[PDB]
Amino acid sequence: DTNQREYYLREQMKAIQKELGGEDGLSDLEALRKKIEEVGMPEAVKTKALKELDRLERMQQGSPEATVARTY
Amino acid sequence: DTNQREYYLREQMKAIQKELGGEDGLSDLEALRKKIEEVGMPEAVKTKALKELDRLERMQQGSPEATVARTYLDWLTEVPWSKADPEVLDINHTRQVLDEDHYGLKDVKERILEYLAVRQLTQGLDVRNKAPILVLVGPPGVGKTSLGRSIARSMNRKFHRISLGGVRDEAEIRGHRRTYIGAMPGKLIHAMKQVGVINPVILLDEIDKMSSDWRGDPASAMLEVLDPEQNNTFTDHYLDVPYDLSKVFFITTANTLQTIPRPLLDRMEVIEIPGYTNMEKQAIARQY
Amino acid sequence: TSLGRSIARSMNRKFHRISLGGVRDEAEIRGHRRTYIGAMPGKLIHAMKQVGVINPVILLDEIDKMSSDWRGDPASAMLEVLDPEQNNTFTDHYLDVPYDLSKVFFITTANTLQTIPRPLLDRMEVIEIPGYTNMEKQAIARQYLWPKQVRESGMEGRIEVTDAAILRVISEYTREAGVRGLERELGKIARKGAKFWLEGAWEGLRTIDASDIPTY
Amino acid sequence: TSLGRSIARSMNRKFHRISLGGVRDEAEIRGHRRTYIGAMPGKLIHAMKQVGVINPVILLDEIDKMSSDWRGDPASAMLEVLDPEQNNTFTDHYLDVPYDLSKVFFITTANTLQTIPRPLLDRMEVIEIPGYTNMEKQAIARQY
Amino acid sequence: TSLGRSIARSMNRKFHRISLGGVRDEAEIRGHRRTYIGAMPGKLIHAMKQVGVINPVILLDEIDKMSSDWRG
Amino acid sequence: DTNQREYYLREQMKAIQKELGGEDGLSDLEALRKKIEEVGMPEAVKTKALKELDRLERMQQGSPEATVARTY
Ligand SMILES: Nc1ncnc2c1ncn2[C@@H]1O[C@H](COP(=O)(O)OP(=O)(O)O)[C@@H](O)[C@H]1O
């Protein structure tokens, strides 16, 4: 009973925080997508930018590599 | 209306994590919001600040990339902003303090007071912006850091000696990104916390000691601080906001000029401190 | 560098400086593996960041001091910063970015031309700048150096020097081929006047004679 | 060094130039082991990688100016690059495999022969290019 | 160095050549310990794996050009 | 079915080791709580240690971050 309560309250609060979030919260994903789509741009670096964006879309936090791909 | 409904939401998050922690369980956010209520700070700094307040309401234990938000907000909320000590630059009051905290050494005190007078008069264009920054050279055993203290208390500022001397890179003069395992501010930003004002002095020790490894040499981020046309434009990897370092005044000591990099040699004048005589040594030994 | 700036504002273009020669390590233009968060730790993409436009004017100080021989040679660490037939896509041969440099106007600054790697020397041509006579030093000190030093010291019309004083300073306080050492001496005279102002101010101007140069 | 480019263009093949002057280490002929950090192949595998074929024309400039101090001896690693019977199995230290350099057209230049070490001079065929008279200099300057 | 391959072809042995000119790394003879990242054994164990027989002919070529006194 | 079984094993074990480790609960945690107080450690580090202990008291044991906290 305590474990099931823990799981329900845990994802309840996380869903609350998601709802308290509009436009994906701050949502730097769409911010860097707009930072791509509004400048330049050549075509092979378009593919490189979109694959680095897709590497950023899968993992979100915990590894250094997510922020590495962000800065890169 | 949206405020009242988001007040519903924020109180809900409160009550739930209160149940989970066995204590408020969010005491940290209640402390840090009251910390943001402090003196200062500029609005882009707070806009960078408010993104990571609201990320630890997802996980509390760990992670190595979530506890860093707690450490980072605690480090950000304690730098001095807009706290000015009563300055005084008087050539008949600094002269008395220098002639009391030392013996002899007429010519170096005079050549310091000249620099102080031009520090005083130029309050219009190029307040020191083309005035060369001060360095003191000489053997060991002469009084050099004691002159740094004797100047620093003659302006009621804070003395806080920062020593490189054993550097491997310029990536320790500038801090490092908080999202790694290495989350450290500048040696200079730590050094900025240790004072109680926004305009102390910061002496630099043996600046003729440089690097050859961790590829590079720290003559590239060091000039970005020592140049008064650059220090207001200073940005660190840890805080990522521009922090003003223009109002502070720097003194530097080195032992030889012949291994200091040329972009730094072209920003400074030298006061060679000669060495003492036997009656000078006898007077220093009796007095101090 | 002042002549490079003169060329840059003559064309209504930007100016930016990249220093070299201090490379104790060999390959810092390179472009080696990821100690940097980015595919270029070299100076070139950072300088392309600091300039906002497509076509700057870039200087390179001391391309001839790449003689270190420490874990590699910095002289062997450059061919493709320039040379606009390969330069349409930039390369470091080990960690690079293909990026256009065919619109940037390059200048190069050296001291002694006998240290450049030989594939780099035969691509370039040379301008040689000799050295100044004492009448050239006196004219430069009147027309450019002394007004700038009395401006930035905050005196600007209450102290003056004569030509005899300039010639005495050049003959007895400098030994150099350039004008960098003369500028510090004129600055010392200005700051000496500043301390004498703040320790009891006079009226009008005071011209500094040839006798007072030891007094300053 | 211009005759190398004209030879490569005249035979419809690829050109690449390696400057051996001032090379002070043998770790840039053959590479390093891949267990170090750094750890890239030597200049020959870089050259063969730029070009996309197995028979280019490689120009090795100023082979009389390699050095032999504490820093090293790169002239001892050249002895297996330029060995005409044994360069069909060339191993550097980065790639552990034998690699075939028997199809490439090595052209080398120098100013004097007295500074090349004798076991390395023994592998190479010598062609002396004389120097010009004034009539030849007039003709070159008129039509080239 | 022609006699090396001629002798090994004559006695029906296997053959492998190790070129020692200019080698000045001790870890080319022995290896590194397996604690390090890209570590692997020296030239001798590698040659014995390539041959595949306990009994080869190894030609250690130009053994008087082994450089000294850099790492060892 | 196998992994839910192994979860059940570990939780029945957790109940029994509640019923023997301490009369009310893991008593070595209370021994740590006394021993932190007995040694004359300074006040900042005592606040640090009591915060770690209070966080540790809600972790499940046999966990790769329970052992780090208990070793610290
Ligand atoms: N008048 C004086 N001149 C020089 N040194 C003095 C004098 N009076 C006292 N001292 C002492 O001499 C010591 C010299 O040490 P320090 O100044 O640190 O040498 P350095 O700066 O060359 O490393 C100082 O600790 C200082 O307290």
mmCIF file of C-alpha atoms in Angstrom, chain B residues 34-277:
data_model
loop_
_atom_site.group_PDB
_atom_site.id
_atom_site.type_symbol
_atom_site.label_atom_id
_atom_site.label_comp_id
_atom_site.label_asym_id
_atom_site.label_seq_id
_atom_site.Cartn_x
_atom_site.Cartn_y
_atom_site.Cartn_z
ATOM 1 C CA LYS B 34 13.834 34.493 0.348
ATOM 2 C CA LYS B 35 17.516 34.601 -0.620
ATOM 3 C CA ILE B 36 16.613 36.045 -4.057
ATOM 4 C CA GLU B 37 14.821 38.846 -2.128
ATOM 5 C CA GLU B 38 18.310 40.268 -1.190
ATOM 6 C CA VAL B 39 20.213 43.364 -2.308
ATOM 7 C CA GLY B 40 20.446 43.542 -6.059
ATOM 8 C CA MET B 41 20.490 41.965 -8.422
ATOM 9 C CA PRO B 42 20.189 42.685 -12.204
ATOM 10 C CA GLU B 43 17.221 41.148 -13.951
ATOM 11 C CA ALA B 44 19.009 38.943 -16.494
ATOM 12 C CA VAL B 45 20.923 37.492 -13.543
ATOM 13 C CA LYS B 46 17.626 36.631 -11.832
ATOM 14 C CA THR B 47 16.197 35.331 -15.118
ATOM 15 C CA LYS B 48 19.136 32.949 -15.347
ATOM 16 C CA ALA B 49 18.560 32.218 -11.649
ATOM 17 C CA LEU B 50 14.873 31.273 -11.768
ATOM 18 C CA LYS B 51 15.279 28.359 -14.188
ATOM 19 C CA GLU B 52 17.035 26.047 -11.703
ATOM 20 C CA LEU B 53 14.963 26.900 -8.642
ATOM 21 C CA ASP B 54 12.122 24.948 -10.232
ATOM 22 C CA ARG B 55 14.056 21.859 -11.346
ATOM 23 C CA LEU B 56 14.692 20.274 -7.926
ATOM 24 C CA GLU B 57 10.928 19.941 -7.527
ATOM 25 C CA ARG B 58 11.346 16.815 -9.710
ATOM 26 C CA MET B 59 14.080 14.895 -7.864
ATOM 27 C CA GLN B 60 15.575 15.462 -4.420
ATOM 28 C CA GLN B 61 18.037 12.649 -3.749
ATOM 29 C CA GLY B 62 20.798 13.019 -6.287
ATOM 30 C CA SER B 63 21.592 13.375 -9.000
ATOM 31 C CA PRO B 64 25.200 14.460 -9.648
ATOM 32 C CA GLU B 65 23.444 16.810 -12.140
ATOM 33 C CA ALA B 66 20.655 17.981 -9.815
ATOM 34 C CA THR B 67 22.351 18.716 -6.464
ATOM 35 C CA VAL B 68 24.558 21.122 -8.433
ATOM 36 C CA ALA B 69 21.481 23.376 -8.735
ATOM 37 C CA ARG B 70 21.316 23.628 -4.937
ATOM 38 C CA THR B 71 25.052 24.326 -4.712
ATOM 39 C CA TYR B 72 24.816 26.819 -7.575
ATOM 40 C CA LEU B 73 21.951 28.826 -6.113
ATOM 41 C CA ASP B 74 23.690 28.870 -2.725
ATOM 42 C CA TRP B 75 26.841 30.132 -4.433
ATOM 43 C CA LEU B 76 25.002 32.698 -6.560
ATOM 44 C CA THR B 77 23.071 34.224 -3.659
ATOM 45 C CA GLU B 78 26.176 35.433 -1.785
ATOM 46 C CA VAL B 79 28.293 37.703 -4.051
ATOM 47 C CA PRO B 80 28.375 41.406 -3.049
ATOM 48 C CA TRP B 81 26.258 43.684 -5.249
ATOM 49 C CA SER B 82 26.225 47.489 -4.842
ATOM 50 C CA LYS B 83 28.037 47.922 -1.510
ATOM 51 C CA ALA B 84 30.632 50.705 -1.694
ATOM 52 C CA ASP B 85 33.210 51.357 1.000
ATOM 53 C CA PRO B 86 34.035 55.000 1.772
ATOM 54 C CA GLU B 87 36.890 55.651 -0.612
ATOM 55 C CA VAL B 88 39.591 58.209 0.090
ATOM 56 C CA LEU B 89 42.457 59.092 -2.246
ATOM 57 C CA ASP B 90 44.344 61.889 -0.535
ATOM 58 C CA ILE B 91 48.043 62.368 -1.219
ATOM 59 C CA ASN B 92 48.649 63.672 2.310
ATOM 60 C CA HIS B 93 46.698 60.859 4.004
ATOM 61 C CA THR B 94 47.990 57.899 2.010
ATOM 62 C CA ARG B 95 51.502 59.294 2.487
ATOM 63 C CA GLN B 96 51.124 59.114 6.270
ATOM 64 C CA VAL B 97 49.843 55.532 6.199
ATOM 65 C CA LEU B 98 52.691 54.424 3.938
ATOM 66 C CA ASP B 99 55.258 56.223 6.076
ATOM 67 C CA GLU B 100 53.906 54.522 9.193
ATOM 68 C CA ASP B 101 53.537 50.943 7.975
ATOM 69 C CA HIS B 102 57.120 50.839 6.633
ATOM 70 C CA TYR B 103 60.580 52.267 7.056
ATOM 71 C CA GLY B 104 62.519 54.100 4.388
ATOM 72 C CA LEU B 105 61.750 53.287 0.745
ATOM 73 C CA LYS B 106 61.174 56.861 -0.398
ATOM 74 C CA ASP B 107 61.294 56.461 -4.160
ATOM 75 C CA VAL B 108 58.902 53.528 -4.449
ATOM 76 C CA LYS B 109 56.336 55.301 -2.224
ATOM 77 C CA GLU B 110 56.627 58.416 -4.390
ATOM 78 C CA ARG B 111 56.156 56.396 -7.552
ATOM 79 C CA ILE B 112 53.121 54.779 -5.932
ATOM 80 C CA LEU B 113 51.609 58.161 -5.012
ATOM 81 C CA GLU B 114 52.032 59.323 -8.621
ATOM 82 C CA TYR B 115 49.939 56.363 -9.748
ATOM 83 C CA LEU B 116 47.463 57.192 -6.988
ATOM 84 C CA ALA B 117 47.205 60.824 -8.121
ATOM 85 C CA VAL B 118 46.421 59.775 -11.661
ATOM 86 C CA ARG B 119 43.959 57.236 -10.254
ATOM 87 C CA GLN B 120 42.390 60.259 -8.523
ATOM 88 C CA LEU B 121 42.302 62.914 -11.260
ATOM 89 C CA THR B 122 41.089 60.772 -14.152
ATOM 90 C CA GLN B 123 37.395 60.481 -13.426
ATOM 91 C CA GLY B 124 36.393 61.438 -16.971
ATOM 92 C CA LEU B 125 37.558 59.613 -20.082
ATOM 93 C CA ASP B 126 39.765 56.562 -19.434
ATOM 94 C CA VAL B 127 39.557 56.511 -15.640
ATOM 95 C CA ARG B 128 42.428 54.045 -15.753
ATOM 96 C CA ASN B 129 41.610 52.636 -19.174
ATOM 97 C CA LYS B 130 44.930 53.555 -20.699
ATOM 98 C CA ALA B 131 46.736 54.014 -17.397
ATOM 99 C CA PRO B 132 49.139 51.074 -17.056
ATOM 100 C CA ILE B 133 48.480 48.728 -14.188
ATOM 101 C CA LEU B 134 50.921 48.524 -11.320
ATOM 102 C CA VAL B 135 53.498 45.790 -10.745
ATOM 103 C CA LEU B 136 56.262 45.533 -8.145
ATOM 104 C CA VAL B 137 59.457 43.583 -8.805
ATOM 105 C CA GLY B 138 62.424 42.742 -6.627
ATOM 106 C CA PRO B 139 64.189 39.937 -4.751
ATOM 107 C CA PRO B 140 62.559 37.855 -2.019
ATOM 108 C CA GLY B 141 62.669 39.295 1.458
ATOM 109 C CA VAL B 142 61.906 42.869 0.507
ATOM 110 C CA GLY B 143 58.567 44.176 1.651
ATOM 111 C CA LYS B 144 56.080 43.674 -1.147
ATOM 112 C CA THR B 145 52.842 42.135 0.144
ATOM 113 C CA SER B 146 53.214 44.380 3.170
ATOM 114 C CA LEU B 147 52.976 47.307 0.738
ATOM 115 C CA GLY B 148 49.791 45.750 -0.621
ATOM 116 C CA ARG B 149 48.315 45.722 2.873
ATOM 117 C CA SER B 150 49.624 49.224 3.586
ATOM 118 C CA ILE B 151 47.910 50.554 0.474
ATOM 119 C CA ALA B 152 44.710 48.536 1.015
ATOM 120 C CA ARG B 153 44.119 49.815 4.529
ATOM 121 C CA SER B 154 44.963 53.327 3.304
ATOM 122 C CA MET B 155 41.796 53.238 1.179
ATOM 123 C CA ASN B 156 39.673 51.320 3.739
ATOM 124 C CA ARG B 157 39.311 48.541 1.178
ATOM 125 C CA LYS B 158 39.686 44.793 1.582
ATOM 126 C CA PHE B 159 43.038 43.154 0.993
ATOM 127 C CA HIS B 160 42.707 39.625 -0.331
ATOM 128 C CA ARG B 161 45.919 38.158 -1.818
ATOM 129 C CA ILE B 162 45.118 35.742 -4.704
ATOM 130 C CA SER B 163 48.058 33.486 -5.648
ATOM 131 C CA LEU B 164 48.519 31.559 -8.934
ATOM 132 C CA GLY B 165 52.161 30.585 -9.148
ATOM 133 C CA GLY B 166 51.423 26.980 -9.957
ATOM 134 C CA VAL B 167 48.912 27.264 -12.769
ATOM 135 C CA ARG B 168 48.225 24.554 -15.330
ATOM 136 C CA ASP B 169 45.591 26.422 -17.347
ATOM 137 C CA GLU B 170 43.514 29.566 -17.618
ATOM 138 C CA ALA B 171 40.437 27.362 -17.053
ATOM 139 C CA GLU B 172 40.978 27.762 -13.305
ATOM 140 C CA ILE B 173 41.249 31.542 -13.386
ATOM 141 C CA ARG B 174 37.879 31.335 -15.098
ATOM 142 C CA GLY B 175 35.497 28.885 -13.448
ATOM 143 C CA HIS B 176 33.921 25.800 -14.929
ATOM 144 C CA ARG B 177 30.417 24.726 -15.966
ATOM 145 C CA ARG B 178 28.178 23.749 -13.055
ATOM 146 C CA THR B 179 26.557 20.791 -14.837
ATOM 147 C CA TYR B 180 29.705 18.643 -14.630
ATOM 148 C CA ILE B 181 31.258 16.906 -11.654
ATOM 149 C CA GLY B 182 33.630 19.867 -11.561
ATOM 150 C CA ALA B 183 31.476 22.814 -10.496
ATOM 151 C CA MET B 184 33.720 25.631 -9.330
ATOM 152 C CA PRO B 185 33.627 29.429 -9.685
ATOM 153 C CA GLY B 186 36.558 31.623 -10.594
ATOM 154 C CA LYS B 187 39.486 31.651 -8.225
ATOM 155 C CA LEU B 188 38.592 35.338 -8.530
ATOM 156 C CA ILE B 189 34.850 34.736 -7.965
ATOM 157 C CA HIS B 190 35.620 32.797 -4.745
ATOM 158 C CA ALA B 191 37.953 35.606 -4.042
ATOM 159 C CA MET B 192 35.019 37.957 -4.634
ATOM 160 C CA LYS B 193 32.961 36.293 -1.904
ATOM 161 C CA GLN B 194 35.702 36.707 0.724
ATOM 162 C CA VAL B 195 35.358 40.491 0.767
ATOM 163 C CA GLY B 196 32.476 42.534 2.124
ATOM 164 C CA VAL B 197 32.309 45.168 -0.605
ATOM 165 C CA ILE B 198 32.227 45.383 -4.395
ATOM 166 C CA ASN B 199 35.529 47.277 -4.825
ATOM 167 C CA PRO B 200 38.396 45.635 -2.890
ATOM 168 C CA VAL B 201 41.991 45.319 -3.954
ATOM 169 C CA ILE B 202 43.213 41.940 -5.180
ATOM 170 C CA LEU B 203 46.951 41.397 -5.173
ATOM 171 C CA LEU B 204 48.415 38.809 -7.535
ATOM 172 C CA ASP B 205 51.383 36.664 -6.514
ATOM 173 C CA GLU B 206 54.365 35.693 -8.755
ATOM 174 C CA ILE B 207 52.601 36.364 -12.053
ATOM 175 C CA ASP B 208 55.774 35.296 -13.910
ATOM 176 C CA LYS B 209 54.864 31.654 -13.113
ATOM 177 C CA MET B 210 53.003 30.174 -16.065
ATOM 178 C CA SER B 211 51.976 26.916 -17.717
ATOM 179 C CA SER B 212 53.127 24.589 -20.464
ATOM 180 C CA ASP B 213 50.519 21.791 -20.273
ATOM 181 C CA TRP B 214 46.730 21.194 -20.439
ATOM 182 C CA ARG B 215 47.187 22.621 -23.799
ATOM 183 C CA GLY B 216 47.829 26.352 -23.689
ATOM 184 C CA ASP B 217 49.157 29.053 -21.376
ATOM 185 C CA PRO B 218 47.116 31.377 -19.129
ATOM 186 C CA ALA B 219 48.085 34.637 -20.819
ATOM 187 C CA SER B 220 44.723 34.627 -22.625
ATOM 188 C CA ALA B 221 42.145 34.781 -19.832
ATOM 189 C CA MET B 222 44.432 36.730 -17.489
ATOM 190 C CA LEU B 223 44.552 39.789 -19.743
ATOM 191 C CA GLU B 224 40.735 39.672 -19.909
ATOM 192 C CA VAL B 225 40.659 40.649 -16.219
ATOM 193 C CA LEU B 226 43.652 42.981 -15.857
ATOM 194 C CA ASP B 227 42.464 45.290 -18.653
ATOM 195 C CA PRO B 228 39.889 47.798 -17.301
ATOM 196 C CA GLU B 229 38.344 47.967 -20.760
ATOM 197 C CA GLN B 230 37.695 44.225 -20.351
ATOM 198 C CA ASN B 231 36.910 43.461 -16.700
ATOM 199 C CA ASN B 232 33.421 44.964 -16.764
ATOM 200 C CA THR B 233 32.895 42.593 -19.713
ATOM 201 C CA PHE B 234 34.028 39.555 -17.719
ATOM 202 C CA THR B 235 32.136 36.290 -18.032
ATOM 203 C CA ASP B 236 32.812 33.079 -16.116
ATOM 204 C CA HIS B 237 31.739 29.558 -17.065
ATOM 205 C CA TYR B 238 30.144 28.946 -13.686
ATOM 206 C CA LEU B 239 27.851 31.947 -13.221
ATOM 207 C CA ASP B 240 27.467 32.756 -16.975
ATOM 208 C CA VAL B 241 26.450 36.371 -16.299
ATOM 209 C CA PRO B 242 28.675 39.427 -16.897
ATOM 210 C CA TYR B 243 30.057 40.499 -13.523
ATOM 211 C CA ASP B 244 31.548 43.963 -13.149
ATOM 212 C CA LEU B 245 35.218 43.982 -12.179
ATOM 213 C CA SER B 246 36.047 47.528 -13.277
ATOM 214 C CA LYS B 247 35.767 49.322 -9.942
ATOM 215 C CA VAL B 248 38.381 47.161 -8.205
ATOM 216 C CA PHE B 249 42.056 48.146 -8.148
ATOM 217 C CA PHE B 250 44.862 45.692 -8.786
ATOM 218 C CA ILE B 251 48.406 45.431 -7.478
ATOM 219 C CA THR B 252 50.746 42.756 -8.792
ATOM 220 C CA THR B 253 54.077 41.380 -7.626
ATOM 221 C CA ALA B 254 56.544 39.407 -9.693
ATOM 222 C CA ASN B 255 60.198 38.549 -9.247
ATOM 223 C CA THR B 256 61.493 38.873 -12.806
ATOM 224 C CA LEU B 257 60.201 40.613 -15.898
ATOM 225 C CA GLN B 258 61.902 38.337 -18.407
ATOM 226 C CA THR B 259 59.281 35.564 -18.409
ATOM 227 C CA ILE B 260 56.070 37.626 -18.297
ATOM 228 C CA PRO B 261 54.066 37.505 -21.563
ATOM 229 C CA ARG B 262 54.192 40.503 -23.905
ATOM 230 C CA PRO B 263 50.412 41.311 -23.925
ATOM 231 C CA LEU B 264 50.788 41.662 -20.173
ATOM 232 C CA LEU B 265 54.117 43.528 -20.403
ATOM 233 C CA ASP B 266 52.389 46.108 -22.597
ATOM 234 C CA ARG B 267 49.865 46.866 -19.839
ATOM 235 C CA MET B 268 52.124 47.772 -16.937
ATOM 236 C CA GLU B 269 54.860 49.962 -15.537
ATOM 237 C CA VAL B 270 57.430 48.615 -13.118
ATOM 238 C CA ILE B 271 58.727 49.856 -9.781
ATOM 239 C CA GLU B 272 61.998 48.045 -9.122
ATOM 240 C CA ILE B 273 62.451 47.596 -5.368
ATOM 241 C CA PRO B 274 66.208 47.704 -4.808
ATOM 242 C CA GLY B 275 67.315 45.906 -1.669
ATOM 243 C CA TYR B 276 68.297 47.226 1.711
ATOM 244 C CA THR B 277 71.382 48.560 3.439
#
